[PDB]
Structures are given as structure tokens and as C-alpha cells.
Amino acid sequence: SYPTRTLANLRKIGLKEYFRQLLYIGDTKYGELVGVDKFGNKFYENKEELPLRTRWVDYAKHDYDAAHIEPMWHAWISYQVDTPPTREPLTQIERPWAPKEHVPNRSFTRGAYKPYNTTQPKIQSWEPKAAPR
Amino acid sequence: AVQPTKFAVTVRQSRNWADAKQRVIAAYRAWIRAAPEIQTMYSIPFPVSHIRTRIRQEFERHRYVNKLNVVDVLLQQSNADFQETMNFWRQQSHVMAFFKELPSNFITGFLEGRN
Amino acid sequence: ISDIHITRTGKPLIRIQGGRSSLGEHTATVFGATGQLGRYIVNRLARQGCTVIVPYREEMAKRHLKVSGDLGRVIFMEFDLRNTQSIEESVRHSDVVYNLIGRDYPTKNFSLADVHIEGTERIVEAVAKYDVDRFIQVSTYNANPDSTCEFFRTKGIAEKVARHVFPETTIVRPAPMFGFEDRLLLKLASVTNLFTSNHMREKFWPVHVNEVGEALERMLYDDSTAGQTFELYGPRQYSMAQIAELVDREIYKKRRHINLPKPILQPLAELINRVLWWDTGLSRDQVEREFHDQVIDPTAKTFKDLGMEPTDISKWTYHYLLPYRPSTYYDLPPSTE
Amino acid sequence: MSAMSIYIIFVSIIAILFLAIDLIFAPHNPYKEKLSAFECGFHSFSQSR
Amino acid sequence: LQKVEVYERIKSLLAGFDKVNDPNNITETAHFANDLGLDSLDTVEVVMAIEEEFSIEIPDKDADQIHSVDKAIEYILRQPDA
Amino acid sequence: VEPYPGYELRKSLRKEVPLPSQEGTKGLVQYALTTLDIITNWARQGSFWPMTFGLACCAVEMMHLSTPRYDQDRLGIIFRASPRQSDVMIVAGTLTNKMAPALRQVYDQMPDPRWVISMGSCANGGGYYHYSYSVVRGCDRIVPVDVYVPGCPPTSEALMYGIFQLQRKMRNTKITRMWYRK
Ligand SMILES: NC(=O)C1=CN([C@@H]2O[C@H](COP(=O)(O)OP(=O)(O)OC[C@H]3O[C@@H](n4cnc5c(N)ncnc54)[C@H](OP(=O)(O)O)[C@@H]3O)[C@@H](O)[C@H]2O)C=CC1
Ligand SMILES: *P(=O)(O)OCC(C)(C)[C@H](O)C(=O)NCCC(=O)NCCSC(=O)CCCCCCCCCCCCC
Ligand code: SF4
């Protein structure tokens, strides 16, 4: 940041937010809200910003992780689409089999994925039947 | 050109069987002369007698060769293995991979699964 | 030894032998495996394709064990002794349970009686509860319920508790152990071990830890070892003075010790252990063991009963003490005096 | 007592206090390969003496 | 050096070698192959053992010449090291 | 009969204790031992120095974390050449059998606390060269591994995500409260 920008952004957002942003982003950013994840994450845009900085996320959780971003918004934050998931029709195809809840990266927890064989064994042994003598 | 390294030996063919005879003795001598020096380079905890025993057995497996062109491939491999060892290019794991520290009967092999 | 192992509960195990990709068919649980002995039993079981549950306390100190086995082979479970559920969750898929949990010195939450008696009680009661085939508990040498040293007494009572609950217990009594990261040879080459109550003249039959991990592996395969009691000791008897002589000959350093009278040192040792957080080697009972002498209790199986012949500590001094030779004498060959 | 004499003391106690912390509150687990010379990962001839 | 000194140590070494047929056959004029029953590789080990004991280096040209105890004694006197 | 006189009576009363993941500060001593753990882990996180060691093309994406777009120094991450001044080893490349002694030697020479990040399919499980005669099928046959990053190559951001996993693991690592349990 530079003095003209930082004071201009500080004037807009207020001192309390300025110190919150110095705690997570470490920057002083101002922009307009574009939408909210199913996880509470907040997304802003400002085309009057340096390249690749015009879109950013305010992470909902304190222990913020990049894998907390919902799939459609993961494309918007990545400049892979320009239309935000608010205005994007593919977020309207009803899929009853889709995760209703937020399914993040589960590693380092007890919810970590455990792999397994999905197939039965290939050879079946005889169950012995000792006929009476 | 680039310099050949410290123990680099030019690859030459054995003139006759007398030539091969003298080279094989020279190679066996040079190996067993170096066994004390191998032990402290590679921190071998066995005594040098075991190291020289293994050198003898490696030479003994090619004992019954009556072909000049097979001996010279063999004299090549020992020259490179000697040069490789003395310049300390290989490490302790390689030298210990060389020391091993099959069923002896059909019935022993049968009972444990094949071997 | 064969391609078929049949267990006490009678289940068969059709094995494919070699390598970490093969099928050892055994599901083991090794309590106390993050210590010194525990890696050698875990490496032996894991590198032959056996599933090993490793109950752990501190996460970062268990990490060297995963390298021993293939993917999915070494399973870490986080447990506490006073967490019975985590004990029961750890032994219930198993056909063998190794109990290697011990501590030389008391701690602010575990006395020697609490870690030996009660810890064995929970572990053995879960072995009984889920009907695990084999239970190899590791006690100490000189273990005796009538002993007065807290170490030799409490590990002697856990021996009887285990048999009373699970009679098929293979009880294993090793002598003081030497090896890599051993608290025998590395302390005599260290500089902190300066205090001492006797003149380092207590005797014992030191045993290679590598040959003890091998012995524990063979007890799993020799089913007839169940319900037995094994003393696993070395080929010679030495004093602490004879061992320390070998160490000096190897490191070329000539270590020295400060001797103290036991009525004086023992009270201090009980203060250092109570005021420092790390293993100091000094405690009231460790001084008491310092004045005691090893006795090989007869009617107890030996290495020969596993068909094994232990090697002498002298043959191993160069391998394990070389990191402690000064630069001037480092390039020298093994002492072999 | 003079500023110079105390200055020498304080710099030495700082050299001690920093050193003492590391000598006490850091793990110490010395083994053979950890205690070898650095030679970019391969052991070579010891010829610095 | 002394001739008897540079011979006494050879007998102890040669008798100390594991698989000579019999320790009595070692004389001042005994042959490794014909008498002491040592093949090519055993003889090369014997010159190697002799050089280590006397703390001298025996070159390839004269190492081959030592097929008998007397030849070892003459070379040891000829080379000025002990 | 019972082994020791108190058996079958003391068994009724026992202290079932929660596991380390199941605990929270309750007294002043737990509060102070957490605070030391906080200040210890915050330092390990804030001064995160990986060895400047890299085997092949994954190192290209690794050195792109040191360049202006991601500026790995803005988080306190500076690559130290010596293993004696390194906290973390990132295995960014294929581990051949000729290199495995050298990877293991410099890992042993790295002081505690130490961590290993496996970056890439080759260091994970051998990758595209898994069926080769000269390739270690995953660096975790050689050294223990704390976090695995997928991709060949993982993007510069994917590696940053794995470093953020490792720091999140440091931040939940119980050091001084671990001793207080033993
Ligand atoms: N080594 C020797 O000289 C001799 C050893 N023995 C016995 O052999 C066994 C193995 O020896 P060794 O490996 O050298 O011993 P260590 O002390 O190195 O290992 C003991 C193990 O017990 C665990 N442990 C100790 N106290 C507790 C507790 N309260 N709760 C949970 N786990 C605990 C430790 O886990 P953690 O690391 O997490 O604390 C560690 O894994 C021990 O039972 C020992 O008493 C007997 C005679 C001689
Ligand atoms: P005498 O008339 O009995 O002569 C004995 C010999 C051996 C010369 C034979 O009569 C003979 O001519 N046979 C054919 C030649 C022969 O035996 N082999 C060819 C020589 S090359 C060879 O044998 C190489 C062996 C392996 C490499 C050298 C050994 C050392 C390996 C490494 C040692 C330890 C390193 C860590
Ligand atoms: S994982 Fe891919 S990019 Fe990385 S070293 Fe291997 S082949 Fe190259």
C-alpha cells in the first residue's frame, strides 16, 4: 500500500475494520460486496486495484483456509469466470445427491478420508463340510 | 581433453593368456592391498579379514573362464569398481550392500513355501 | 517360519513372506514403541508386511516409525494410559499385543507403581476383554514383588497381574540393553553422567537391543512361547567399570566420574528428578538400582530357547561409539583389543 | 562503578542468557548422521586438518 | 636387518595361515605351490602378508618373483625398510 | 484371590482422562503452559526456513514462491542453503537411488524441530517414473513426511497451501502442555 491509497481506504472503512484487516489480509482493501458463500465467506471486487488483486475474499472462519471457498466461487476468485455465482445459471440445477453442507479439506482431522477396496475378493475358499464317517 | 580421474585406467585388450594371467593377479593384489584402507574410509566394523574374504570369493566365481574376451570385460568391471571405491564416490550403504552377513533341501523348501 | 500360521484362537494366516509389499497377516499392537526398544520390534513386524498399531502420546516423536512399513501398514492411534477407551480401541483388531510401557523414574502424574501396575492392568484387561491371542509383556530383569527397589518391585507385580488376568502371557525379562540410542553406552560416553553412588562396580549381563527385538519377533511365531517367562541376557557378565573401560578404549577420551555416598546422593537425586522436567538419569530409585546386582532367575527360558546366540557388547562398541571419537582418533580402525 | 565495566558485564550476560536458553529449552537428540560433517550430502575425505 | 630375524617372523606368519597342508614343511628353501600347497591367490596373499609385516611395499614386477621362502628373504634384505 | 491385596476393589474407582485433542485450559498452569506453546509455535510459524534443496521441475514452482507474485518472504519464509540453519526440507523432485543417501544425509543433519514436505507425484509415490529401475517409489521410503502436496507440478499456490497446512499443524502442536501430560 501507499499513503494516498491507505488513507483513502482507511477513511472509507473505519479504524476498527482497518485493524481487523491488518490482522488477516495485512492489507487495507476497500470494495463492494459481490456475494457470500454457503460457508459465510465474503467476496469483494474493485477493478480500480492492481492486477490479480481486484477480487479477494474475506474468510468467514478465523482459522481461514483456502479450501473453505465454495466450488463456483473458487472459479470466480481465480479469474476463471467473470460472472459471479449469484448470476450464474449452473448454480440452479437441482441435484438432490449434492452435499447440502460444506465439505472442506478434511486432512489433519479425524474426518480425513480413509481409502479402501470397493471390490470383493477374487477367490473364494471351500467352507469345509466334514461328512460323517 | 578432460583429465581422467585418479584411478582411471585406459581400456585395453589382453594380448594373450599370459597378459590376462598377470593382470588378474595385479587386480587381486591391488584389492587385498586396499582392504585396510577400505575399512577406515567406510567405517567398516568388521575386521579386514572378512573384507579380503569377500574379495577372494568375487575372484573365485570367475575362476573357470577360458575366454580372453570374457576375462577382459571382467578386468574392466573390477577396474571401475576399484576406482569407484578408492575415490570414495560410493558411500557406506553401497559398500555394506556388498556384504550379505535358498532352502538347503527340497523338504525345507516345500514346507515354508518355495523357499 | 512357514507359509501358514495358526493362532491360539485358531484363525489361520496364509502368508506371503518377503518385503514390505507382502502379507504378514498379523495385526500387532505395540504399546511403548516410541522408546528405544520399540522401533526394533516395529521395524521387524512392519517390513514383513504386518499391520502395526502404534499407540502414541507426543505426535512428533512417533514419526520415524512410519518409514518402517508400506502404506496403510503402520497405524497411529493417540492414547493415554488413563484413557481406557483409547486402549481398547487399540488392541481389539489384534492377534498380538506387546506391552513395552515403562519408565525408570517417577513423574508428577505417574509413579513407578502407576505406570507399571495400573498401566499393565488396563492393557491386560483389554487383552482379556477382546480375546487377543498373544500378549508379550516386557518386564525388567530382577523383577520381584518382594523387591525393595521400586523399579524391580512394581515391574514384578505387573508380571503377576498379567498372568492372573491373561495366563497365556509371554513374560520377557531383558537385561540392561545396549544399541544405537541406548541408555547404556551413550551415557558412559556422555559428559553429564558424572555423579555415582557405588564405584560403577554393579554387574549385569548386557544384551543387544537388536537381538531383543528379534527375540520378540520370534515369540510371535513360536506359539509354544505363550504362557512362558523369558530372561534375555548377554553372553558375559560385566561391571559398569568394565563397560566404561571399553567405552574409553573406543572413544579415546578417558571419562571420569564423581562418586557420592548413597545417603548423600540419593536425597539430591530425588530433588533433581522433582525439579527438572527432562530425564536426568538421577532419581532416588535409580540410585537404589545402582547398588543392586543382576541375578538370572532359573527356570526361565533364554535366547537359546529361541534358537538365538547373543553377541558380546565388545563387538559393538566401535559401531555405536564412533560418533564420539575426537577428530584426531576418528579415522582409526576399531579397537579390537 | 563505571559505565564501561557494567557495559562489559551486560554484553557478556546477554551472550550467556541467550546461550543458556538454547542450552535448556531446546531439544537435544544427537546421532551419528546428524553429527557428521556437511559435504552436500556425500561423505568425503576428512582433510581439513 | 638380520637374516635370521627376517626369517623367524615368516615362519610364524606362514604357520599362522589357516590352510597350509602342514606347518613342518616350511624351510628356508620351500616353495609355496609345490610344498606348502598354495595356489595363485594364496601365494599373492602370502606376499601381501609378508609386505604388511615388514611394513614395506612389494612392487608388481618383483611380487611375482616371490614363489619360495628364500626369494622372500633375499627381497627383504634387498629393500631397505623394516 | 487377587494378585495384590487392593485388586477387584481399586478397579471400581479409576480416573478416565480425556485425550490431548480433548482438553482445554482450566487453571493457571494450563494457561501459562498454553501461552508458552503459543509463543513457541508462533515463532516456528513466523520463521519458516526451508533448505534451498530441489531435485527437478517441482523446484521451478518452488522458486516461484520466492518471486514477486507470491513473495514467500512476506510470510517469513527464507531459503537457507545449509541444513544446519533449516527448519523444513521440501522434497521437490524425483528421488533416485543414487540420490537417496544424500537426501537422507542432509535430512539427518537438519536440527529439531524439523519437518518434511513432500512436493510432487515423484516424491510422493514415484510419479511418472514409478516403474523405473532407478527411482525410489516415494521419498517416504527414505524420510518421514509431514504433508503431501499433489500435482506434477503442484502450482506455486498448491505448495503454499501445503506450507499453510504445516503451519496449521505447528499451531495445534502441543509442546509444553505435552510434557505436562508426560
Ligand atoms: N532399556 C533397558 O536398558 C531396559 C529396559 N527395560 C524395559 O524395556 C521396555 C522398553 O525399554 P526402552 O524402549 O529402552 O524404554 P524407554 O523408556 O525408552 O521407552 C518406554 C516407553 O514407555 C512409554 N511410556 C512411559 N511411561 C508412559 C506413560 N505413563 N504412559 C504412556 N506411555 C508411557 C514411552 O512413551 P513416550 O516416549 O511417549 O513417553 C516409551 O515409548 C521398558 O518397559 C523398560 O522398562 C527393562 C530392562 C532394561
Ligand atoms: P592360478 O594359476 O590359480 O591363477 C588364479 C587365477 C584367478 C588367475 C585363475 O587361474 C584364472 O586365470 N582364471 C580366470 C580369470 C579369473 O579368475 N577372473 C578374471 C578376473 S576379473 C574378476 O574376477 C573380478 C572379480 C570381481 C571384482 C573384484 C573383486 C573385488 C570386488 C569388491 C570388493 C569389496 C568392495 C567393497
Ligand atoms: S512431480 Fe512432475 S514436475 Fe515435479 S519433478 Fe516430478 S515430473 Fe517434474
From TrEMBL, chain A:
Q: Name one GO biological process term.
A: response to oxidative stress
Q: Where, per UniProt, does this protein localize?
A: Mitochondrion inner membrane
Gene Ontology cellular component list: mitochondrial inner membrane; respiratory chain complex I
Keyword Calcium applies: no
Q: Where is this region: Disordered?
A: 101-133
What are the protein's UniProt keywords?
Answer: Electron transport, Membrane, Mitochondrion, Mitochondrion inner membrane, Respiratory chain, Transport, Ubiquinone
Q: Which residues form the signal peptide?
A: none
Major localisation: mitochondrion
Please give the family membership noted in the entry.
Belongs to the complex I NDUFA12 subunit family.
Q: Could you tell me what this protein does?
A: Accessory subunit of the mitochondrial membrane respiratory chain NADH dehydrogenase (Complex I), that is believed not to be involved in catalysis. Complex I functions in the transfer of electrons from NADH to the respiratory chain. The immediate electron acceptor for the enzyme is believed to be ubiquinone.
Record-given protein name: NADH dehydrogenase [ubiquinone] 1 alpha subcomplex subunit
Organism of this sequence? Chaetomium thermophilum (strain DSM 1495 / CBS 144.50 / IMI 039719) (Thermochaetoides thermophila)
From TrEMBL, chain D:
What sections of the protein cross the membrane? 6-26
Q: Where in the cell is it found?
A: Membrane; Mitochondrion membrane
What is the role of this chain? Core subunit of the mitochondrial membrane respiratory chain NADH dehydrogenase (Complex I) which catalyzes electron transfer from NADH through the respiratory chain, using ubiquinone as an electron acceptor. Essential for the catalytic activity of complex I.
Please state which protein family the record places this protein in.
Answer: Belongs to the complex I subunit 3 family.
Q: What's the protein name?
A: NADH-ubiquinone oxidoreductase chain 3
Q: Name the source organism.
A: Chaetomium thermophilum (strain DSM 1495 / CBS 144.50 / IMI 039719) (Thermochaetoides thermophila)
Q: Which residues of the full protein are shown?
A: 1 to 49 of 146
UniProtKB/TrEMBL annotation, chain E:
Q: Which residues of the full protein are shown?
A: 59 to 140 of 141
What does this protein's UniProt record list under function?
Carrier of the growing fatty acid chain in fatty acid biosynthesis.
Q: What is the designated name of this protein?
A: Acyl carrier protein
Record-level GO cellular component terms: mitochondrial [2Fe-2S] assembly complex
Query: Which residues are the signal sequence here?
Result: none
Question: Transport: present as a keyword of the record?
Answer: yes
Is Translocase among this UniProt entry's keywords? no
The principal location of this protein is mitochondrion
Mind listing the UniProt keywords for this protein, alphabetically?
Electron transport, Fatty acid biosynthesis, Fatty acid metabolism, Lipid biosynthesis, Lipid metabolism, Mitochondrion, Phosphopantetheine, Phosphoprotein, Transit peptide, Transport
- Residues spanning the membrane: none
Question: Which molecular function terms from Gene Ontology are attached?
Answer: acyl binding; acyl carrier activity
Q: Where is the Carrier domain?
A: 4-80
Q: In which pathway does it act?
A: Lipid metabolism; fatty acid biosynthesis
Q: What does the sequence similarity comment in the record state about its family?
A: Belongs to the acyl carrier protein (ACP) family.
List locations, semicolon-separated. Mitochondrion
From TrEMBL, chain F:
Does the record's keyword annotation contain NAD?
A: yes
Could you tell me the superkingdom of the organism this chain comes from?
Answer: Eukaryota
- Which keywords accompany this UniProt record? 4Fe-4S, Iron, Iron-sulfur, Metal-binding, NAD, Ubiquinone
Q: What is this protein called?
A: NADH-ubiquinone oxidoreductase-like protein
Residue ranges of domain NADH:ubiquinone oxidoreductase-like 20kDa subunit in the record: 57-165
Tell me, what is one Gene Ontology molecular-function annotation carried by this entry?
Answer: 4 iron, 4 sulfur cluster binding
The similarity comment for this entry is:
Belongs to the complex I 20 kDa subunit family.
Q: Which organism is it from?
A: Chaetomium thermophilum (strain DSM 1495 / CBS 144.50 / IMI 039719)
GO-annotated cellular components: mitochondrion; respiratory chain complex I
GO terms (BP aspect) = aerobic respiration; electron transport coupled proton transport; mitochondrial respiratory chain complex I assembly
Binding site residues for [4Fe-4S] cluster: 57-58, 122, 152
